[PDB]
Design a protein around this ligand. Structure first.
Ligand SMILES: Nc1ncnc2c1ncn2[C@@H]1O[C@H](COP(=O)(O)OP(=O)(O)OP(=O)(O)O)[C@@H](O)[C@H]1O
Ligand SMILES: Nc1ncnc2c1ncn2[C@@H]1O[C@H](COP(=O)(O)OP(=O)(O)OP(=O)(O)O)[C@@H](O)[C@H]1O
Ligand SMILES: Nc1ncnc2c1ncn2[C@@H]1O[C@H](COP(=O)(O)OP(=O)(O)OP(=O)(O)O)[C@@H](O)[C@H]1O
Ligand SMILES: Nc1ncnc2c1ncn2[C@@H]1O[C@H](COP(=O)(O)OP(=O)(O)OP(=O)(O)O)[C@@H](O)[C@H]1O
Ligand SMILES: Nc1ncnc2c1ncn2[C@@H]1O[C@H](COP(=O)(O)OP(=O)(O)OP(=O)(O)O)[C@@H](O)[C@H]1O
Ligand SMILES: [Ca+2]
Ligand SMILES: [Ca+2]
Ligand SMILES: [Ca+2]
Ligand SMILES: [Ca+2]
Ligand SMILES: [Ca+2]
Lengths: 117, 358, 358, 358, 346, 318
């Protein structure tokens, strides 16, 4: 029995704290009622199922997200998109580069019958 | 600083703490004064004139209710209300004015930091792990069929029946008059009530049980009185609760509980009736009779579409379903946002209690 | 400066000193008076009418429990309560109310200088030398599966069964009736219990054992009754305890002890089940039947995943696993800081138990 | 990000700020300065009395505007202004004195190494991949048609309409009154702003939509308030923004947006009209309504030469077209030469803005 | 005839029945499963080995769940950014090889999101083989904003083996890898302040912890407890040029439309085994808070059962009456072929 | 919409918007240029009807070509698409530019190495700079051939159709690029987690950096990259150094990035910002860049339509 005592004492300081344990889903939440972790869980579950059953019929169309600028417009496929957008911005900035470079002076306009002396 | 859960019934207060598997405290809901100020619960029961500040589920006496609550906090649970969020319960179809008073009292009179009020039958459903079903809640003072879909009670389909526990006790005293046993006084009624709770059950077929009682007897049972005297009881065992299926038994014109359940479901939107049939939950002391489950099962089967899914849920703890529901709910991290705080009350006043919900 | 250990059961009190190998005192957990105050334990055996202050593992009679505790201190152990830190044990899922009342009586009536309460099953697990494992405690009134992870009992997965030892004695009395052996009286029940503990065992394959009883018999055994007469007992030897695996033997509708064990383990986190399977520890007088280990190992391996390591630990002294466990704990250096002190109680009340003992 | 250019879009309602090259502004907050009833943006929203230092797209409170920029640098973007060339936006027809003042403060107060000032509308155009078109810019405080040729806004052709988003919110509040809903408080004005934003839309054919509404229902929508109440909204959904097309709805004498669009095109050189009609770009939050582009299509359709090419460009990012346009411009190799440097500023002074920003 | 649910991870298959509280079965994804315990068909979340994968599923139906596939509609999970290719093939196999009556493919992250009771937010899913930031809006993953990190649970174990090497504890073998993984799971945690926690180890020690090996002897571990998971915030620890998971979350949000950012910051949900460290929640916030616009509401949400968030999400979804019409039916598949999965699963 | 990348050794085909070419299969093309118009039309017909299984009149079709492709090839390929196959629209794009696009960039310098030709292509804002483009005929098939030659030492002989396939396979399965070839040689001869075949693993692709291994006095791929850079305007060079992307099957060797990083480091001024881009899918970077571009809305206006072709002729391609 002197020995049963030592293993124990080394194993009781090997222990994580319950906070940590419910923190790891091993413990149920202390403070919830201990009989009725089942129904408590059931209930939280339903609660969620219900939210889902609703937020689902309310599900928008891909279209609509893109209308809001949530998703990129509009093809191609999940993975391509990421880069494709980089390319969209790239191709355009460049398309703009010379456009501004070769920008008529004010004189060009005035003589082209636009704007006053 | 743990939250308090207080279920005010017509007959019994049930009180305790969030977290807890059952109400720490349970006492009669009565205020007495000499026939020194006022005696509350059992103090009054032991010269005194008695009032029930809750009738058929509803607070009808505010000053006495106030006195009930003070006893609950300070004498039964022994807590300072300022330090405790408090969840109260209410009856189905409680007028909005009550819950506002009830709130104002808690905040200005008890200076609770936060509080909540929930519907009795709803909590009972919750304690069955469901958000949808139809509750038969029957306490001491009232019975309700309360359909609930998604945590919303369906008020247009709620059935109330003034027949409940006390009425059953009183009727048992009258049918005990048949064997010529005399019960009237304070003391005497308590005995009858104990007999009810210990010996009564629900006959699966009442008329068969009657044609049989008029015959054999595994039926008859004995009971010892305090002074040592022993008594014997027969068909009174199942005739007493039969009143719930035949209210004509106490001269009530109303339909029986199976019928009111059906009618309640039928007052619901047709789409959800399947789900109601499949989730008939019972709660409250008056649902505690052995065999009630199976008798209801039978009665409901007799009334519904013949191929309908019918399930009766009668948790063994249904004696305290309401309260337990409270305890679970007040315990949830998700619920903590839903307390009405003192600050909220101050800026918004009592009307704020109606808001939020699940 | 010397701890004491008291393990309070439905049937028996186990009590002694910390660092003891075994409880100095084991006596029946009962209080009696004529059918000169009150008679506790074996005093009541010497005519009288009885109460068991603990039913199914939980304290239900505080008055009489107090007389139990007094007897333990003054008659059995013969100490001055005031001078000994005292470790108490409790049933799993003991109502928060109970731990508190127990704490309170300890400090206020018996003036213990310090105390603590742990959960029976965890003690047994410790006497097994583990902090993680699922225990099966079967005593006289109640049987539990209690998973425990790193010291902590897992409340959601706890299983309770109202079948236990007392039931089994009673059953043996009834089945000895078949061979026409007459057993009913107080004296007779004791005889039967003796036979139970001395002669009964768990058949590794029941149907086969039955069909073997029916044939040969290395199986039949003789037993000399205290009056000099000799009887012979056969399949009753294993039929009696078989009831634990088939509660239907006494018409109880619950599943058997292996089923409950399986279900209890399946109620726990999937990542720790492996660890529960392999550390299944037995305790209590009622797990004392020979070969129950073996039976259990088979049943469980049948039910679990085939790759699953199953191991039953059943230490020989599991009769007192709980007590011994307590003796070990009480004796820990690391534990001395964890007693609840008189000072701490005065300042925080009975509720301190909840923060210190878990 | 050591020397990355910054882009700051100063709208009447919202400041849009970030770093050149990003798709989206780093930060968007309200354009306000507060003192007790100084704090900036969302800081001020959370007790205070506020100013909006930008009215109808034009800076009107210079001291407070500086505090807006300081917050942008140090609280929102968190940078050293001396390390960063900074692009600003301004409204069409910003008077020359404002341009100079704005320049001076950037260089003298914040010691920016470089800066540039661009037109809200032109940047929007740029972001769409155009240097020639007519923009309709409608934010919170003001609405403009801006015809633009090769990046040059045409001052003689510009239309300003003081009706904008703010005004639409206000009017919605007003008409909600008809269902008898009061929305009055600053906080309520927010809610309505939200309602506007979520559920309003522009009818294709207003008269038809009215006559339709009375019949069908796709129309009526319900909306849940902060306080748990549900309101219901109908033709207000589309009568709100109809205002843009019929400013008489709020008593304004101006012709609608379609008409000012048409009229602005007509104040541009005849030969460039085809190009304008075919490049009608919408920008600014208020251009967000579902249906708006189609309605403009059909209204300009009915206004133009029956033979003209009609195109409405309404990008999903149009809320921030202005800022994105800024991001892309500052990021161009060609633009690098176009920055005003501190050296240039020291040698010429504030008026350098006129010859450098055009 | 209950619907079936299967989360295919790089490391583990999680499988069970719709309506169960968690998976009936979990086993390693290797060739099958626990047979190989007494090739990995999934790498970095992607099925790359179709034949072994088919064996994986086969094991699942027949050895693990013990069900006839034709009798049970089946939901699978997929990684974010899964190639259209994968979706189709995975569909074909189910209907053509396993003859399922109906099936669906849902993204792992989204199932986790639903499980938390949201349909919008930004998930951090990190299992054994890959880590992602997945912003999702009403169930729609936002593909341009999805962030991928190859460092995951497996790597962390391996790095723990390497740094325990410094203490001169030798872990090298198959079975030693397993010990170290348990040590990781049991003793590791995330430092709120790494530099400080280092400075602390070197001084005090409530820090050091002890662990008893199978052979009886005890080892003692200190800074390795927090240095292991620190890799997630400092991938240069294992020589990766990547920014840490805090950083990727920031970058991910910033790639989404500015109008939903506040909702994302406020709904940052964690899922998968590698998010299981004590302290991780709190650290993330610290770090996210330091990066973001300072008025921003940041909430990190980490449900305790997040190890299985994904599976659970699946269990639930399939359990919904709303969902029964959303299954791809055998009939429908016959009528449209495997490309039906892109019109039905999104 | 359809994307067809005609390489010398592998035809890559599929649908714009997909991850990867839906079909990859096996010469009508020599060193990236269509040389056999008979077999070219057979391979195209095969692509539509046997491989992708589409009716060509219903699909806009984007094609690829080598850098510096004779403008007449583009015209004949335009002619064949509109007249033989009756496509409603089409486009022709530069292999290397597409690869850079697939990395999301429009400025950089690309090293494209497939089965039959290798190029260095500097690209500034979408435009390949023809004056700085480098061509080397050493590529994938040729590395297979040299592995057949060095496997001669171990005394294994491979010559036939079937046998060259085994060697191509071995090349793709076990070859890698040494960071320090001489240290790698000195080490193989010593230790060996090397042997699986030994030093041939890295000697085979070493040929890219030392063309003398198959008898060329040509500059290695690092040098030609540098030479290409030095043929560009000085003010655009830092951009090219910072964006060196590799594409084509023959750049698929583990460690190739790491080696090139070392070699280019040795060529530039020592303060220069250097980045080598090596995506895991660079085998199809060209096709993927095409899938991308054809999927862009901005590009839909940029197709050559059947109508535009009918009115303007094959030369409309320029
Ligand atoms: N086992 C039992 N069998 C039958 N009746 C019982 C049993 N236990 C308690 N009761 C009765 O139930 C009644 C109390 O139930 P409960 O506490 O639900 O009522 P309450 O909440 O006070 O009243 P109400 O909800 O109607 O306001 C009492 O009349 C009591 O006699
Ligand atoms: N060798 C034995 N074989 C079978 N049963 C035994 C044996 N020894 C004791 N028992 C029985 O064990 C029971 C008492 O065990 P124990 O002391 O663990 O119960 P308890 O702790 O009093 O009850 P509980 O824990 O149920 O509250 C008695 O019924 C006794 O007859
Ligand atoms: N979805 C929407 N539907 C309608 N209106 C919107 C929507 N979103 C934003 N708005 C309106 O956009 C306005 C803000 O847009 P914006 O940022 O362009 O204004 P601003 O630049 O601050 O103002 P201004 O350009 O007028 O000086 C607000 O009135 C807002 O209500
Ligand atoms: N408590 C814990 N602490 C730290 N890591 C853990 C813990 N529990 C499990 N893990 C790790 O989580 C990983 C497995 O998680 P999971 O089942 O989410 O991965 P998966 O879905 O199979 O992989 P992936 O999603 O990367 O394809 C392993 O690396 C395991 O060690
Ligand atoms: N993993 C690998 N390692 C080395 N070489 C490979 C690998 N995979 C493929 N290759 C080689 O790449 C070549 C095919 O690649 P690719 O399809 O890019 O060429 P191509 O486009 O047909 O030719 P080109 O662009 O030269 O006209 C074959 O020689 C093949 O052996
Ligand atoms: Ca009640
Ligand atoms: Ca016991
Ligand atoms: Ca603006
Ligand atoms: Ca996973
Ligand atoms: Ca090629």
């Amino acid at each position: 029995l002197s020995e049963r005592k030592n293993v124990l004492q080394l194993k009781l300081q090997q222990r994580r704290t319950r906070e940590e344990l419910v923190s790891q889903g091993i413990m149920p939440p202390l403070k919830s009622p201990a009989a009725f972790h089942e129904q408590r869980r059931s209930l939280e579950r339903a609660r969620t199922e219900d939210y889902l059953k609703r937020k689902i019929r309310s599900r928008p169309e891909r279209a609509e997200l893109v209308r809001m600028h949530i998703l990129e417009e509009t093809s191609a496929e999940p993975s391509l998109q990421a880069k494709q957008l980089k390319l969209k911005r790239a191709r355009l900035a460049d398309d703009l580069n010379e456009k501004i470079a070769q920008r008529p002076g004010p004189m060009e306009l005035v003589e082209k019958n636009i704007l006053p002396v | 600083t743990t939250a308090l859960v207080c279920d005010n019934g017509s007959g019994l207060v049930k009180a305790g703490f969030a977290g807890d598997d059952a109400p720490r405290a349970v006492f009669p809901s009565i205020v007495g004064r000499p026939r020194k100020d006022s005696y509350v619960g059992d103090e009054a029961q032991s010269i005194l004139t008695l009032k029930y500040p809750i009738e058929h589920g509803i607070i009808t006496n505010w000053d006495d209710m106030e006195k009930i609550w003070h006893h609950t906090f300070y004498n039964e649970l022994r807590v300072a209300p300022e330090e405790h969020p408090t969840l109260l319960t209410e009856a189905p179809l409680n007028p909005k004015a009550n819950r506002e008073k009830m709130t104002q009292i808690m905040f200005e009179t008890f200076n609770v930091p936060a509080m909540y009020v929930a519907i009795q039958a709803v909590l009972s459903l919750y304690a069955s792990g469901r958000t949808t079903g139809i509750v038969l809640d029957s306490g001491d003072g009232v019975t309700h069929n309360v359909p609930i879909y998604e945590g919303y009670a369906l008020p247009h389909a709620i059935m109330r029946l003034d027949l409940a526990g006390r009425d059953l006790t009183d009727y048992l005293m009258k049918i005990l008059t048949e064997r010529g046993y005399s019960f009237v006084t304070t003391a005497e009624r308590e005995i009858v009530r104990d007999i009810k709770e210990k010996l009564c059950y629900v006959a699966l077929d009442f008329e068969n049980e009657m044609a049989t009682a008029a015959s054999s007897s595994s039926l008859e049972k004995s009971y010892e009185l305090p002074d040592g005297q022993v008594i014997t009881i027969g068909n009174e065992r199942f005739r007493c609760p039969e009143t719930l299926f035949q209210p004509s038994f106490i001269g009530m014109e109303s339909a029986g509980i199976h019928e009111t359940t059906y009618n309640s479901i039928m007052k619901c939107d047709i789409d959800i009736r399947k789900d109601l049939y499949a989730n008939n939950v019972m709660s409250g002391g008056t649902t505690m009779y052995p065999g009630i489950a199976d008798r209801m099962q039978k009665e409901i089967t007799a009334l519904a579409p013949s191929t309908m899914k019918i399930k009766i849920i009668a948790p063994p703890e249904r004696k305290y379903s309401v309260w337990i529901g409270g305890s679970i709910l007040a315990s949830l991290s998700t619920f903590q946002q839903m307390w009405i705080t003192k600050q909220e009350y101050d800026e918004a006043g009592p009307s704020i209690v109606h808001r939020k919900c699940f």
